[model samples]
Target: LSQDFVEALKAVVGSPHVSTASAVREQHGHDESMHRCQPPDAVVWPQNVDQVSRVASLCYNQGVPIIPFGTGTGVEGGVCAVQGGVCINLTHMDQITELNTEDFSVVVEPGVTRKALNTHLRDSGLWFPVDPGADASLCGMAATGASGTNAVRYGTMRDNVINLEVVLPDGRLLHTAGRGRHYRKSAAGYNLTGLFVGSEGTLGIITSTTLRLHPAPEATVAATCAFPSVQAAVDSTVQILQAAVPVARIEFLDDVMMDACNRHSKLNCPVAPTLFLEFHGSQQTLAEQLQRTEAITQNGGSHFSWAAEKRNELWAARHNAWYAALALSPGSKAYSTDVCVPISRLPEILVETKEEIKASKLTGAIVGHVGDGNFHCILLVDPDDAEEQRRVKAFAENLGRRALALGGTCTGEHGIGLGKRQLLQEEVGPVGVETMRQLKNTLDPRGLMNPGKVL
Candidate 1:
């Protein structure tokens, strides 16, 4: 960008809010992913939607690329400014602008994280439940269509958003579901809300999100059950689903992850293939749920135990699993990868991947929101180990292909960021990719928003 553009940016957001400093630009360059830093030419902080529009308009007029930056919690290089542009970081817009208790919905600015949203709704009896761990910004979560353990029951970001206020590439504001329209369902025109849910800032900059909320469970109980093997753990999960248990969360951690969490999170949980569970219901219903769940897993010889006083503690431990896995190899870099497959095929993929990694001299621990048919492996490798990188690349590709063969997707929640482009081509093939491009052209003719990602 030229000095003129920087001056205009400073003018729009107040001189102090705009940053051309190397440190600020470098910080906005990349996210938690392993992708190399590719900072934008300029960085700006807009406090509200109108300022975002002014900056967007400025960038568009200059023909400069624009990238949206959230909390930088993504693992897929989701926020890297691959092509030099103006990075509009949304950290200053953390506001919960609207809350409708009767409607069970709320509107949040770009910087409101799932955790922050919940915290804001602290004593309100209603909460935003679409969690993706890491306390990522809610707009970032919506941009990536994030999901977490509760996703098995509450559904992903795709299912929870009611409307989005987005700034088109040319800087016009658009309310996907119509301005002030927060109805749960509408058979009106195109479902624009759905279109932008996982667009990853490729389509537009999401300024405000109208989120669907869920009532806090009346009574809750969390349990951890250890199984003898991966197969048994998966089998028990399948049965739990089959038995129609309304489980709030059903997470899977193989022996490796269990050991890592035990050592890192420092809990005395057993080191085995374990299922962390939570059930939401009335006190009376919880007993039946607990009884039925225990009975279903009986054949697996699972040892079910309460993980409360312990729910937050245990889940916090699970959420830190990525860091925990990294602890096993002090100096190793992490290539956190995941894919989705059919529920029935979970046993095959889990066991096969686990056994394959065991046969190789790789350090990867498996943890998953198994209820969604997606599993993540935290692969730790020496950053400069060419041999290790080559092996991990092939293994991840193999795992992706493995999922593809089983009638699933190359990725579940992790969007197509920098590293998965080739896999995306393989997954979608040319025809589908071209169709996506057509849509991309329709919305972002210049491909200025978050370029070099998701196609």
Candidate 2:
């Protein structure tokens, strides 16, 4: 905290905006990820786009790193300012700007949370469909290109964004795209919207975003199906994807996950490899879709179960499946690894991975957005033990390799943050790495935006 640096920041956003309280620093310093916490020297709350731009300029001039903080709930290290400079907190910028029902779009500031937006739209006959489980900020979700259970239906952040107003690294504010229902395919120029959506603030600060919205479903139904073996469960998912049953949400939870749900929610549901499923459409259409899914799962050796209340409870338990896994192994850290392979290759991948987990003699659980061939294996280990860390790392690497060998991504929805950068380079090859570096340089010439992240 040099006098000159402090003065420069104060000149831009006033001194009252800056804080160094231990508690505040701690909260801003860490994220929900496994990265070791390194508190930024200061955290500043900027209220508007102009204040955000000035803060970035001041940080850039001073050679201080600036990491944007949005809810600080990201599971990756995107929100962590490891180099210790300024964290631009966005909580104060939350505001819904515009909503056009005809265009099915909503303009909002970066700080608005998904849960907040959903509640606001509950009565509007419209909804923002992306659900990453946590109520993450819209800007944070865009930065990570986040998706969850509904991703198989609604698509990821990449597909939902209409336009973006971003403040570049050197302090220039510009609208990369425009607001309109037209221009889905542009021969006009390079796609800047695609570039910044998942840049994770390494490129710029997103001020406001135009998000695509969907009409509320006329009728919806959710259900759960159980199978005797992991292969049976995965095969059921494969059959659904192949049949194209119009399933809105299809999530998988193994026996270990089932046990966790039973303990945490006190639900006496049978423990087996299970799939929690949902369908959206008119009553007749959704019912037909459910029938098709039921037939597929039934042929794959699964017993289908249905009902709205049971479905809600099951999905709720599944959503907390990560924390529930942690609760089962009290006083231990849960390391989550995500791997996705081609839908057709999923059964083999799960079989080999299950054997590997067993071989390690580790207490773990498996679950995933199985319809999209993305799965996470949660490994619980004592945080204080260095040996356990090594074991977890080894298992994660093997899983990544297997996913890649089967023609899939290292991470399906989770973007390449600090933890997965090396794996990203390996998976995409040198040309892809160079292309990302070129974009970073073009957009953030000063490298003041989230330095030492991604590439």
Candidate 3:
């Protein structure tokens, strides 16, 4: 009986688009997460909206679970097929549907990546800015409400997505902001766009997304500055932001992260607390802004100078921080987990996290975008060592609880998948979580849409 489901999917989207091979199934099963591979029964690649609709309709009729797969860069296991189902891989629908440069908006299919969009926008002088370091799918970014280094200035996926074209559980298409509407702001009634931005595909499949765009900066400056401690580094960021200097990116790396990067690149840094900083503006304004940042760092007992050019190596090291941390232990797997705290309480949480890592005797490195109070711990462990796995899990759980205690979210950038479902309920109280579940049950009555996730 279950074998008929794959044939049914093939009938809707063509045999070429549907695959029952184990290799394909395994690839579509998990993301960058540490979650075990839970492959879907079959994988389908829908090339257009109509095909996606038909495929979804067929699945709904057959009572098969639906798992939406994007580029699979998600750190959380959102794409993991916890129950055997059909994986709707959206990579085939890779095209820019429309662009309105005058209005600073564009429409894109589910497969369009951030880097791909920017490459297309080179001549337009406008670019999509919701970068999550993985070249993630634009629709996937909206689905997970991604925020990254530039989010401090440009805002997150939640802010940038003007509208979404979602396929609801019953295979019904929903234009979140209404039909053919792409205004910068609306006095709309329900704000349905906000509801779906962070839904993590639990409610529906995002087939198209209307995204907000920003102009490419005319001038840019970057530097890697040192601080005596994370507190000092984070404090200086507050000072710079408080001064209205408009930093484009403000990232933090503790000594462990720095030392890892230095060894990975065979370079030298202070190996204390560090900030990889960037500022963007018109040529004259950028000079003033960078000067302001230097003064703030100077006041915070760290020296900084604006890099006019040839600092590419500095950013290279910063971008490769994950690889650097992983290089600490060859043939080991690392899990990326993050939490956000109030900026005032960031130092406290970071200190507690550091102490926890040392106490647990685990190998991990700390890094994050400081301005948003969202930091990450890259915990390395041997896959075969079950005892060490328990330690890492306990360490992550304690970190999430500490973030909650500090008036922060269990997750900052990464969305809730299997790992943080309980923490999600804890992050929001019983009533809050229940309210979501009511909506979940209301929208997905059959419980066939990305089941076993979120609430």
Candidate 4:
């Protein structure tokens, strides 16, 4: 770390908040992803947008990288500081600036965590719904364009973000979203807000955001069904979608994943391919939907066991499926692969992947938001084993290629961070890639913000 750069950071946040020590550097250098750790030169926690702008300017002037970090739970190495500069820890900016229940929206600092927002909205009868199955910071989730179970109904973070307050690399603060009536679709000019939603922090630092909220479901019912084969569960899922049953959540977990959940989450579930389904509607409607799903599953070699309490217990375990995958091999680390395919190809792709997993002699499991044809195969391996890392990397690459060939994306909820940059180029093409570069140059011309990430 340069002494002059350290001094400049100290000017804004004081020396106490600016750290170049090995401990802080190593901690912020990596995330939950499989990418190798590369520590940053310094780490600074800024409390507000003004402090963030000043710190960014300092890094820009020095030509040092400026990385905005959330909770660091990203699975694509989104928070990694490959260029080794100051990592702007945004958690200190945690604050809900405004909550207008009448308009069903909330404005908050980007540092606010999902758990914190949900806790606050518990009493408001409205909730922010994009969940990545972890208590990730909202800003990081938005940067990665995260989605989860609720996305089948409510939508992803991209759909929820109405406006954003961002700080450009040159230390300019600007607002991209309008207040109240002036919000929504615009013909005024370029949709800059849309451009930043999934840019993975390469454009600008998201200091604050305005998010849309939906009324809490009037009534909710989640049920689980066991299938004799993976194909059976997928068939039932397709039937439900075709019938327009209004499913709030629909997830599929292969037998291996279920066994992992049993060991890690301490629940006894049928060791067969399974479907976890949720219905959000009036009591009568939920009952009707349940009946329809039951018939579909039954015809496809599945058994619907009502057991709501048991189902909730199992679903809770399913929510942390990645932990279960890690626990499969006592001393192994988990590598998560996310791919989405067209709804029609869900069954065939899952079956083929399962066959490949079985043949590879790999300890893994499949669990995902199957309603949208997005699934993950949790591959467990030793972090120190280079051979295992290469094998897993190959498998992830093949999975992405197969997804692209099937007219689906290489990633579902997880954004293209360092881990998936190669797949992004293949999926989005060179022209699309050039456009993204143009957007980044337009907003952060200095290229100081989140250097060496995404495109």
Candidate 5:
């Protein structure tokens, strides 16, 4: 049966596009997460929307599972082929199909990476700002509902993706925003676009996405402020948000993370709780905003620095945080996890989480886009040591629970893939999960669309 399935897949795409090679399968099996790799039986590349539809339809008819593969940058194990079926690598489908400068939107095939899109638009004076650290595929970003450093000001993938051209479970095509991809707002039917934006390939495979774009900032300024404690840093963040400061980005790094950045990025930044901030406005407007922000920081017992060169150096290190974090304990696997709480409760949560990490005697670093009250911990563990793994798991589990208790979510940007199934259930309760299952069943009745994930 497996041999026959591979043959059919080859017929749908081409022999050159279909492969059962162990290396190819292995590449599609895992993501950046520590989850065990479960390679698919075969991997297929579809170059066009029609090809994707044909492959999906054939697999649907044969009851063969289908896992949509982007760049495999997801840390949640969303693309793992746990049921051992066929993996669809979309890298070949990359193309910027359309750009509507009038509507401030652009249409792109699934394989287009965020950085690639911005490079394509550099001359256009507009950019797509939903960056999730990695140069992740735009379609994958939409599929996973990814958000990054700029999300506090620009919003997440869910907010940026205006429409999606998706190939459904049974090979049917769907347009979430209907025809003509340039609608700013709609009172039109149910929000089907939102329904699949974060479905994580459970319902269908996205072939193309129309993303909302923002005008490039006229004058941008970056700054960093050091605080005596994490509590002071977070308290200042809350004040900034409450005071309605239009900060483009406001990120926090605990002392440990600052140390990691210093060691890895080779900078002599103050080893203290720090807030990295970026502001977008006219030069005159920015000066006034910076003055107000300086006053706020001083009131919170913090010291501020706004040297452009220094800011660029600090942010570059910040962008390389994951690699920097891994460098902290070479060869140790990082069980990176994120949670979000109400902005008002961020200080309490950060203090408790830092204390917990310290008490656990584990090597971990804390960093976050605290403007939105979302943070992540990079918990390093020796993968071969069962005892160490257990302790890390316990710490992560407690962190998820604490976030829920503080009126937040188990995951702020990372979706509920292989690692967070239990946490998802805890956060949403059985009823919410059941509703998700019902939707999954209704859309992919054969359960061939990335089985054993999410639900």
Candidate 6:
């Protein structure tokens, strides 16, 4: 970028908020991935929507690529400045702008993190349900269409987002849902809100977001069940879903991941295929639900055990599953990838995936949100081993292909940012990819919004 352009950015978002420092640029370059860092020419922090619009306008006029950044927690290199442009870091803009108790919605700046928002709503009897493990920014979660254990009930970010205050590439502000911050349902026009929810910042920058909130459950209970084999565990999961248990969360952990968690979280959980589950309802309903779940697990060759006091510890272990897997192979980088299959095909695909990992003699751990049929493998490999990295990449590709073969998607939560672009084409076909490109061209004609990402 030219010095003149730097001065213009400074003028828009204050001189102190704009930086060309090497450290700052490098910090804003990459995310929590193994992708090589590509630092931007400059980094700017815009504190408000007006400032964001002005900086975007300046970048649009100058034809300089602009990448919108949040908490830097994405693992797909979604926020990486691969083409060396100006990064608009929104961390400084963190703020909760509005709270609508009557409509059960909230409006927030792009930089507000999920945990922070929940903490703010602790006393309000309502909470945001979408959690993608890391305490990522809400707008970033919406951009990636993130979902976690709660998604089986509350849905993903795509369903949670009510509207978006977006800054277009040409410096115009757009209200995606027609300026209404709270609306449960509307058929007034096209679903533009859904269109931008998971664009990965390729279409426009999300300045502010209106998110739907859910009322906190009156009673909550958690339990875990151990299975003799992967098939038994997955079968129980299928049964639970089939029986309409209304489980808030049901997570699966293979033996490898169970061992990792046992070592990392210091728990004495059985080193076997296991399902960690949580139920939310009235006390009487929860008790009935637990009884039914226990019977299903027993029929599948395991017994259920309740742990209300240990709920926090168990969930913490689950949320830190990636770190736990890393602990199993110190100094190794993980190619953490995920896939989703139909409920009936999960056992077959998971079994085949585990067998492939064993045949390749790779250190991989399997964990998943089984309620939604999404599973992940943490393939640990030495960063310096080229051949090992090649094998891991091939394994991930095969997994993607297998998912497609099983009538599933290459990714369930992680969006196509850098690594899964090819899989996106394969899963959607050339015509589908072309349709996405056309949409990109329509919204970002200059092709300056987060260049070199997502199609």
* TM-score of every candidate: 0.97, 0.96, 0.95, 0.96, 0.97, 0.97
Better of 2 and 4 by lDDT: 4
Q: Which stretches of candidate 2 lie over 4 Å from their true place?
A: 179-185, 299-302, 308-310
Off by over 4 Å in 3: 265-268, 299-301, 305-313
**Model 3: pairs clashing at backbone N, Cα or C within 3 Å:** none
Model 3 Cα lDDT, one tens digit per residue, 69-181: 99998877898888788899988898896699999999999888988999999989998877676778999998888998889999989889999999987888999998668
lDDT of 2 by residue, 1-455 (tens): 78788777777778898887778888898776766677888889897889999999888877888988888766657777778889999778999967887778898887798888988888899999888867788988888788789989988898998788888887888777754333356656777888888888899998887899998889888777788889888988898899888789999888888888889987776788888888999989987897788888884555566655777776677778878888987888766778888899999998788888888868879988988899988888777888887888778877888888889988877776677777888899999999989988887777778877888
RMSD of 2: 1.7
Candidates sorted by lDDT, best first: 6, 5, 1, 3, 4, 2
How many clashes in candidate 4? Answer: 0
lDDT of 5 at 38: 94
Q: Which scores better on TM-score, 1 or 3? A: 1
Q: Give the RMSD in angstroms, all C-alphas superposed, for model 4.
A: 1.7
Candidate 4's TM-score reads 0.96
What does candidate 6's lDDT look like per residue over 268-386, in tens digits? Answer: 89899899999999999998898888888884556667774499899889988988998988888787778998998988988888788778778999998889889998898787888
At residue 308, candidate 2 shows an lDDT of: 55
How far out, in Å, is residue 394 in model 1? 1.6
Score candidate 6 by TM-score against the native: 0.97
Candidate 4 lDDT over 1-455, as tens digits, reads 77877888888987788998999889999988778888888899886788998998888887888888888888888778887878889888889967888888788786688889989888789888887778888877777888888888889888888888878887888687554332556787787677778877888888888888889988877767888899888888888888887898888899998888888888777888988777888999888888887877884555665554766676678778988888767777777889999999988899999999999967779999988889998888788888988888898899889999999999988888887888989999999889878877887777777877787
Inter-residue clash pairs, candidate 2: none
- Kindly give the number of clashing pairs for every candidate: 0, 0, 0, 0, 0, 0
List per-prediction Cα lDDT, in the order shown. 0.87, 0.82, 0.85, 0.83, 0.88, 0.88
Candidate 6 positional error at 328, Å: 1.8
Which one wins by TM-score: 1 or 4?
A: 1
